[model samples]
Target: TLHDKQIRICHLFEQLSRLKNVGKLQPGAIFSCFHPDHLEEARHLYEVFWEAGDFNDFIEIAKEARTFVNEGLFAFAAEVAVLHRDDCKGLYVPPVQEIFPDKFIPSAAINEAFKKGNILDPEYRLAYYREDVGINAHHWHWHLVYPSTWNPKYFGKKKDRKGELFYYMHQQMCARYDCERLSNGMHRMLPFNNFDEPLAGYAPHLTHVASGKYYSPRPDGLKLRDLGDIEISEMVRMRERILDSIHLGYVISEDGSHKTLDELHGTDILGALVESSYESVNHEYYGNLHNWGHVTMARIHDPDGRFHEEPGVMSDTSTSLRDPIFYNWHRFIDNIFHEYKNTLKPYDHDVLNFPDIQVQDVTLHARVDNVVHTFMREQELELKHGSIKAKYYHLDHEPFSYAVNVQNNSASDKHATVRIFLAPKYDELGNEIKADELRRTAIELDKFKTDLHPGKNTVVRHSLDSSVTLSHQPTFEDLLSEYCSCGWPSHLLVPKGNVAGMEYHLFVMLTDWDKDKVDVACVDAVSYCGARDHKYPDKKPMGFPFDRPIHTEHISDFLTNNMFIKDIKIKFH
Candidate 1:
């Protein structure tokens, strides 16, 4: 039981480790890597802890942290050290709800939380999806897996396609959020393009009980001040440099040599540069745009720290999405990535089609009425501090499965990887979106390998078995046994459709398995985060089929026999 509590506390601490206002480094208190005093001490302790040649040596050094001034730094130092240990891989981290139950426990009931508290803030309607505990947990776990500061040399292995995954994972997340907005009768989110303009602010009406301090709420019409115009100019310069490199088809390495980014690895290279990770092509020239963007926005309230104010929700990945601006900021980031994507050749018929395999029909086997729905649910979490009972809404549907009818025209049996995707059928104005634009909004639902008979085959895939999701674990009781805690929540698989039913394009495509199969594994949701300590399972691009742009004008024109699109509706109960 002590070990269990240790594991739980460490998991919560891991999530809180990055917050800036985690308070003084006292016993049983939260520590922040952002604070100057904490970082000064953390660096010293982390260096000493890093000297451990083995897990046993590491444990000995980790144990010494107890006497190292404060428990907060001790926890932070121990956690970071253990994460870097070669033998400490695959350890379970508890869900964030267990540590920061304030995020899950609403100040009001679900129906009231959905109401627009302010006449100017209609964005509150979609709080159900944005503030969901599981969504935040997925984000926190994703950043943990693919941290920008992580060094491949120190970590023993390179994160498979880490750079590209950073782009894809966030891109898919933005798209999913956009779909949710449309379902709620809101326009697709806009990017935060002009930094000088006044922007909307956020207030997370919850307290970080561990730290004994409420997060600072940013005021409305807060302008970017403390980040400085010079830093803003540098960000602009970096963007231009990256755009120049995209135009030239090569990135300049640190050694003055040119590294070609025109090949399939182009996005990966650009991603590292944009994210300004350890793998960045040239950090000095590119600058740290993405990370600094977050840091700058987080301090909008008290940029110079004159008031010693805490950071807004953007300061913590676990609570960032609660603010609508998170989507806007990411949308801006995604658009820059899209600029590079637009320069590349579009997905032609040859690249998208599997000639031998023909997909005859695609249908969802849901309830008899053939509609999916979402409803509110309650969950209780037991934390080191106390217990919290919270109300959250999640999508609910019958035991649904995809009936993908396929015709194998070849003489011999063929194996194909069934790819399923969904996209909003209409825009904010109720206008039908074209294939070229809709492709960018498509979200991968499932990807799996199937053996097709020589004649015809029916591939029935349960929604629970989606490769892009982790089956919802209602409670944290069994979290310690999980392999990797990174994934999209399975319950939020379907967007919350409106009362009258929101139309969606459910598309399925079959690709050759031999060409698409990779050498490895996952607990689930490998499509976004990839499997733990293994190669990314899919050989094709992360979002395949839709990863590249399509030139087709109409949705029907974009389809081949290997692909099928079904019009479906999701109605919220």
Candidate 2:
């Protein structure tokens, strides 16, 4: 159907033609008023089309027409061309074939043929035979075959011309009927029941055929059938064969050297192939008429095929194959490889090897010597790897372990003591209790007045002459068990209530109360739940303690429209 603007433009052309026929030259000259504002509007319209950067020559011509006519008249002419160029191309005084040979199919004798009242070719007759009564008389035959009746060689035999014409039209109709069947057969080969699925099944079969499988040149002839069930090994063999068939290089006639596949299928060929495949798949899935090829051709002739300004939408169906729905289908295809990779052992030994791999900046490599096993209250044993040289003790006694090795280095006086802190637990007094807690308590008991050295190492040994035992009554495990039982719920039980775990914050603080302390804290926080808790009744009891402080801040009054958090600080010293 023609647009309203196009119809209005047609009426304007009709009026101009009538006036020209009646010798009313003055009124007919009003067609010149199609130029609006004397080329200003024309230049603006031209620029608009130019900036679009697509195929815009049709709009550019309409812009040109506006230079010699009034804005309204030029708009009408432009609309006529834009909306009905296919009809106008045939109806214009000189057919489009004569004026635009490179664009439309060129006809050498259309001009000379049109002057004569020849009904030789139906297209020519439709273009030139211009009378209401004559059009009415030929309208039925025109309907039978208008565009398809262009070729005259097929319409031979004078007496049987009309019958022969109908026969030819019927044959074409039958050809289309058979073509539709072929198209349906082609459609069945598609993997998807609907357009939502990504194209898959077709390519694998084509790949198989290309590799000379199933339809191979056999002893008798070509055989086409699935060869029983394909085992994993057979599929692996097929993959290898397919990859081997891909062309790697070809010799150039002029040059002695061969061109690689990458060189031959560079940008140009690849781009064209991509575009053609995109167009073909879109047309196949979404119906051909609404396809881009048709839409582009319609745009070229200035006829509206109602192409969406944005690509990929045709009527209600979206021709986009890259959407999420299609992604899911491809995801299934990708999973095929994952399942195969896990279950199928394609390689006899190691499939992939990196011989030249390098490791940089590594200083030490240690081997596991012994695994310490501790029983939880739930009777589960947890194993942890430790150095063979390290001494192990029950958590109830030490709750920590240490390994020491002395290297014979030049600096003998430069001593270092790495204090081992493990599985720290907070006491009821909110004091941090670690494996060293007993030693600190014993020192306090002995009333030693010695102050810790700042940033210096101090080594303590019970066997030394000046070394004295601090208050070492209860071990770290005993203290922690007492703390957990007294403060926490009974259902929350630690493993053996004695086994020690490795993890703690190191505080490089000195006993010098006046000096600033070097704080180096590394804490591992764990969440715990008790058996009595309904949310996790059967769950194993675990650590449940907060080891960090939280801060809050106040919001500003000016930020009324936005939500903000208030600020405050809480410090643990």
Candidate 3:
């Protein structure tokens, strides 16, 4: 009976829904680090577990400790702490939107039953995306799994290529967000590079749990000013130093030695420095550019803490994507990464070519509709804060499948990995997007290995089977047990094209599987989310093919027989 009780209590760490039941957190008590008090409480709990050394000891301490503090605080600390243990590596966590619906679903949408919801501003055209619960959940889980601050010794496995994953994942996010912008007839979000310039303000009508306070909003003209210990000059210097390293083709190590930034590991090394992760080679020199970037901007409205305000919606990973500035901030960061990427050599013909194998064609087939359709869908959520029939409005699409025709001219059978990518066919001005930007904006649609006989081969892949996405999580009622929920939402596999049907390009390539395969386990969305308790699967760089510059200026000139691009249209109903 005692063991059963411990098991039930451990369930608190598994899913946020069950975890919120701990101490019966009265909606306002759900713990998040955005609040100063909650953050302090979390640091103490996590530090204790980090020092626990062994899994059994940590579990015992966790069970005993939850009895003493804020149930919400204890659950938050215990959940993140449990994630660091090698023994608890693959344990499942629930979607953040399911647990804290109020944080992700804006108030207006809940009041209107997912219909006729719009802010009285043009920027609100993207609200359907900025407030989408599933997208926010993906952001939250991505940070949770590859935390920049967690100690690798405690976690047992170094986050496999974590620094590079940081670059690749956020790069993809910016690219996808830009796609959403073009769909809404808007220009791509601009970078937040100048602190003196007044930053665009955001008023996310979401509630903070502990104090019943709304996250502090930045009025339209508030300028970024110096906050405690975070100085603009320091960040400026750090940025220049990082760029210098990129130019020098090497980085300074913590030991005062120069480490070359090679093609294979340079991005990963730079990622750690920019993110100020524990794995950074020289944290003292690089400074905390990325974390403090969020801090200074999130606190711009209350830089002096005179109003005793909680941080803005941009403060926490779970709620950050709800604000417009998150994109602006990341674009600035992504630009720095782009500077490094620009210096690297382009992927050459040797790496891009697959001998004797040619991809004939790639086409899209909508499972239910004649055209791929995106529509608003409402899903109910159970919240910890209060009683209301809360619903999360997200964009859903008609299921679709991709058919690829490949010709193998080899004398015998060969194994090939089919890599599929998607990108907008044109810019907001309707001009064809250039190869340079297209290479950066291309999103991985699906990737799988298949057999190619001596003649022709046809391979069909369902949308649900994407290597870069995860199917819907098994309902809690059906799952007597659980594991990690760290994949991109299946429903969002297709971008929300314009109502008039926007054209998109599907780029398919057949690469030698022997060259691409790695010895590791993979889950859906492994292209972005990565596999738990295993090394990254693909041998190529994370955003292969399009990860670097194009050898030619035109998309057509850049293609070979091993690759094919097809035009498809996505319509919203």
Candidate 4:
């Protein structure tokens, strides 16, 4: 009911999408309420003044601004209003991923022989994951779903644990990247250990068409110099001090107060500090450690603006994944968080168990696939700037594909929330991986709800309807929606395995819906997209059971003792 006087942050999300340089040209002008670049400025625009009622108004207004949308900013935002907004019960997904069209794909290869027969440069094999336009778009989209500056203070942190999620999502990504790396005979990503030196010399031949402009090119061993009075060592010091606070089991606020970072919210506070968000209590001491790592690496080739260069792909979110060093940098960032987590005790068995919810069975079947259960699909990606180019391959399968038998031991009917995860059955060396390592590697496959009859129930769920992911692939026109997020590319739902096929573990856990429930406007892709007009849908920690340690040594052992969960293998070719 009370606020300071402010001016209009007026512009249609569509109109705002078309204009370039609006950040520099018109600071107050934003599509909807926030532009990725204008954080504090968005504050001045009364972002806090917004409410749940505005959710639909923005969605309808967004429809007026749609461009069949390329996977660009404005289109992304409009789709978010329609798909993720609580008030707007729309089920639209863009056709493609959020990415710059021509440059995203290596429009034409570097030559007849780009990355040929494997002499085995880890970086070369790494290129597929690093440069895949769709993967990058997922990254861009994830950020959109949980923008650091998304201030819906219409209630207290209505965005709900975004800062903690910033850490969790990134950590999961790093784990996924590392697993993929090891699968290809590469060591886990090398950390950017020596801050003074240049990271792995990256030359992204990603070129721009008009005027033949290129992204930053780093020569061998280029060093990061002082930009904005920041030093590489200073970055390290900030991290060390932050770690010290973590082990000391408390955080130092900006106002010179020390607060205990208990088991419940310690990670949350550290996440905010390490990311150095505006909510970060003491930026003066903590320093912008993560943001600065990006700045230093992005400008290593041209610090002080001497060469008059734009920051490298490391500087921009859209293209950062294209670089190998981006993973290494985050590897170190995640290492700090992991080290902090070490100090906390493992979650006790009783704490994680739900006695009545016994997930007795879970097996998946495809309506159409080879005898061994494998399938392939193809599509032509239409780029925004050019005529229809060539075709691209994506993996998909026939569709409600689970033999999930749930038994409700209790006398009353039960509402159960099903959580699914997938991880490699073995390590890169093909050794059987125990539960400890697999826990960290676990990737959220989906989360859904079902009603369990008092005795037994067979819940046949569809993969397309996975709460952690999109129903199906979106068109590039669909991908264009700004700040919209869908889960992992539906095609890559299962990992790419050798022709001999790779072994993967599907872990299913059923919990009491009443205890685990979050009443959000929607659960579609809620695994990645936080709930609309709601808190996070699941009451458990974002990456539960895994976020903290589990006492059991083997995953099988736990599943044996705790009847509510089950794991099975899916072999891929």
lDDT of 4 by residue, 269-355 (tens): 788788776667787899778778777787788777777665567765667788878888887887777777778788766766777
What lDDT score is found at residue 7 in candidate 4? 8
C-alpha local distance difference test of each model: 0.72, 0.20, 0.74, 0.60
Residue runs of model 3 more than 4 Å from their true location after superposition = 1-44, 50-60, 67-76, 82-91, 107-118, 367-370, 384-388, 475-482, 520-522
Error of 4 at 318 (Å): 1.8
lDDT for model 4 comes to 0.60
- Which residues of candidate 4, in runs, are more than 4 Å off? 1-99, 107-120, 151-157, 193-198, 209-211, 367-377, 394-400, 472-484, 520-522, 560-573
Ordered by lDDT, highest first, the candidates read: 3, 1, 4, 2
The estimated TM-scores of all candidates read 0.88, 0.14, 0.89, 0.79
lDDT of 4 at 142: 72
- Per-model RMSD to reference: 4.7, 38.0, 4.5, 7.0
Off by over 4 Å in 2: 1-245, 250-259, 263-268, 277-573
lDDT of model number 2: 0.20
Compared with the true structure, what per-residue lDDT tens digits does model 2 show for residues 1-573? Answer: 234333333332221210111111121121111111222332343233333333245434443443444432343233323322333221211111111111111122212222333344222211111111111112211221221112223222111122222222222222222222221221101111122222221100100111112111112121112222222233334333222322332212223343332321222121111122211212121121112221221122112324212111110011112111222222222222222222322221121111121111111111221112222122111111100111112211112111222222223232221211112233323444443221111110000112222223233322111111111122111212110100111111111111232212211111111121112000000011011101211111010000111111211221111111111111111
User: RMSD of candidate 2 to the true fold?
Assistant: 38.0
Q: Which one wins by lDDT: 1 or 3?
A: 3
Return whichever of 1 and 3 wins on TM-score. Answer: 3
- Tens-place lDDT per residue, model 3, 191-307, is 888767788788888764334566778889887788776678888999899989999999999889999999889888989889877789998899768787778777788787787
